[model samples]
Target: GHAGTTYIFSKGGGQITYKWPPNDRPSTRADRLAIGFSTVQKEAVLVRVDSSSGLGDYLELHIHQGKIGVKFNVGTDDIAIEESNAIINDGKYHVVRFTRSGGNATLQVDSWPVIERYPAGRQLTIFNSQATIIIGGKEQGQPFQGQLSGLYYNGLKVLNMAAENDANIAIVGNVRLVGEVP
Candidate 1:
């Protein structure tokens, strides 16, 4: 299931940045993202999308203390959905799926039971024009070592785009298109 082109991100200077194509941006309605990654560290950001405004209205998926979780804010209170039963840091590949419909969202890792989240009270529910997608996390710190494959957000195959050297992608330091180097 993990058979796809990969990009390995070392602990140092590793990051990927891409501005979503006009038609592929995640809007205020519903959105979905899926990615396969394997890491030895206990915490790492898988993907993060920030709104055009810079702060609020963002979506992020990360693994903390061996458990995967989804954290985001849609003009409402910050919401975090973390899985408590599974610890996924054995250095093996695992697929993560995140889906959101309005203020409701579900996080599913591999075949584990899906976890859903619905925050209290109704707020803005709008994730305005999502700007960029960052793959190796913010600020590039916090002990991360891994390879990510086939990152699909909405309709963009960004990892594939990076491998193709698309202008929309900017591959930063310590990150490599896996097979191209070794």
Candidate 2:
């Protein structure tokens, strides 16, 4: 096992309190949070954070087992994943990357270099140090009901070995952007 410390950002058991370290700054800074759902379920639940301030992007890194997630874009309430549950358990550790750039963001999974994408949400610079990001949930409010390990990032890697951006990205947003934008 790697020295990688997966802290519990939040507990998914209906209205749980997720915790995240402070980013300190407001702009030009990045934060990569991860949550591993130890338990697999059938119902699509929620994973919300207490806050989200920096406003760059809220990427969700995990194994796309079920491939059933919700999609919300630009000031809308929220939507469902319909039927395309492509990620039906692969054990390769998939990632649900969420990017919140320039008031517009999207979700991507499995770095295929040109496939798999989801429509995320678009809001102003809601990126702050006090922002708590929730996964497996809905638009930062609905809490995800599952098992979550912790989160990490790109800069954390000194010589390209860390789970950069919280998951084997070498450099988050460095090479390609793979995820679901909705």
Candidate 3:
């Protein structure tokens, strides 16, 4: 995927780790970071284990039935955004970019026109709590079975499909990372 160096997350238990303690969580909304990545999953959890008691806190980005969707919490208020134009579960590399700033948020699937919304007032979508950025799945299961590459945060390339702790993104679980793509 994306030319070269793609991490393979085989069907079940697998994930790439990004550990940020509650006290050290990144302020995604304020920083205006553009989180983008290329992924290919048949029918897997792209992101999950919501910060809420069930599945309603922090944020959850994934493919449900083939459509790309994202749900996040804003000061205890849950908000969901989706892009129904493309089916990412077709086993093809699709670039997903998400950006939240001020009073607006945008989700772009591939090169499609962004699906956006401007909530009243300046809202913070990302919560400052103990959350794990598990690329493949959650702690209780729902692992992603596919390939991921070209992951970027705030315009910086943090994940280059490596097995080691390259850039700022940490590596954990049974992730089988590959060499850097040229």
Candidate 4:
């Protein structure tokens, strides 16, 4: 399984943290996240990022039961989208694509229906320079168990950066570089 593409995560929990220096934080005017993962667990955190630190503005991609969802909040209000028509917990690799442009967001899992979120009332649409990223359920408790192939956030190839031993990335717990991130 050591093919330079996958990273394996154990059941209890494992984590990968990526932090950007304050000066070069991601300028999230528009956000795009695409991740490929496979898990049988009902609930697991795929990736989460914070803005102005936690409890301020944030975005997360998580899989619960058999559905994939995206939850995020700008400075104004919180919004969420779940593709309930698609059940992806059968242990197969599913590429989840999430995009946020202005005040609208879209979540698509594999070939499932597109779930969209468009909050009204002219809320805060853009995220303030986000600087931190957490993957594979570290702080959330329920660890994602399986393989994560590739993660693309804005212009960052996170898993590939991890495979290359980028100093900005930290890996913890029962995680190993394998086919998914070998």
* Candidate rank order under TM-score: 4, 1, 3, 2
Per-residue CA lDDT of candidate 3, range 108-160, in tens?
A: 87789989966655565454443455577645366676666766654434355
Task: Give the alpha carbon lDDT tens digit for every residue of 1-182 in model 2.
Answer: 11233222234333222334455423323333323333344444434323354233333333333564434322333323322536534333444444443344344444433232333654444333434433344334433433333333323322122223443212211122222237
Best by lDDT: 4
Instruction: Indicate the worst ten consecutive residues by lDDT in candidate 1.
Output: 137-146
Estimate candidate 4's alpha-carbon lDDT, on a 0 to 1 scale: 0.82
The true-versus-predicted C-alpha distance at residue 3 of model 1, in Å, is 2.6
Q: What's the lDDT for residue 88 in model 2?
A: 31
User: What shift in Å separates residue 118 of candidate 1 from its native position after superposition?
Assistant: 1.7
How far does residue 5 in candidate 2 sit from its true spot (Å)? 4.0
Clashing pairs in 3: none
RMSD of each: 2.6, 11.2, 4.3, 2.5
Tens-digit lDDT track of model 1 for 29-84 = 87789899888778788788888755578888888898888888887778888777
Better of 1 and 3 by TM-score: 1
The candidate, 2 or 4, that scores higher on TM-score is: 4
Off by over 4 Å in 2: 1-3, 6-39, 44-46, 52-65, 68-85, 89-93, 113-147, 153-182
For model 4, residues 64-123, the per-residue Cα lDDT tens digits are 876888888878777888888767888877888999987689988777778788886666
* Candidate closer to the true structure by lDDT (higher is better), 2 or 3: 3
The candidate maximizing TM-score is 4
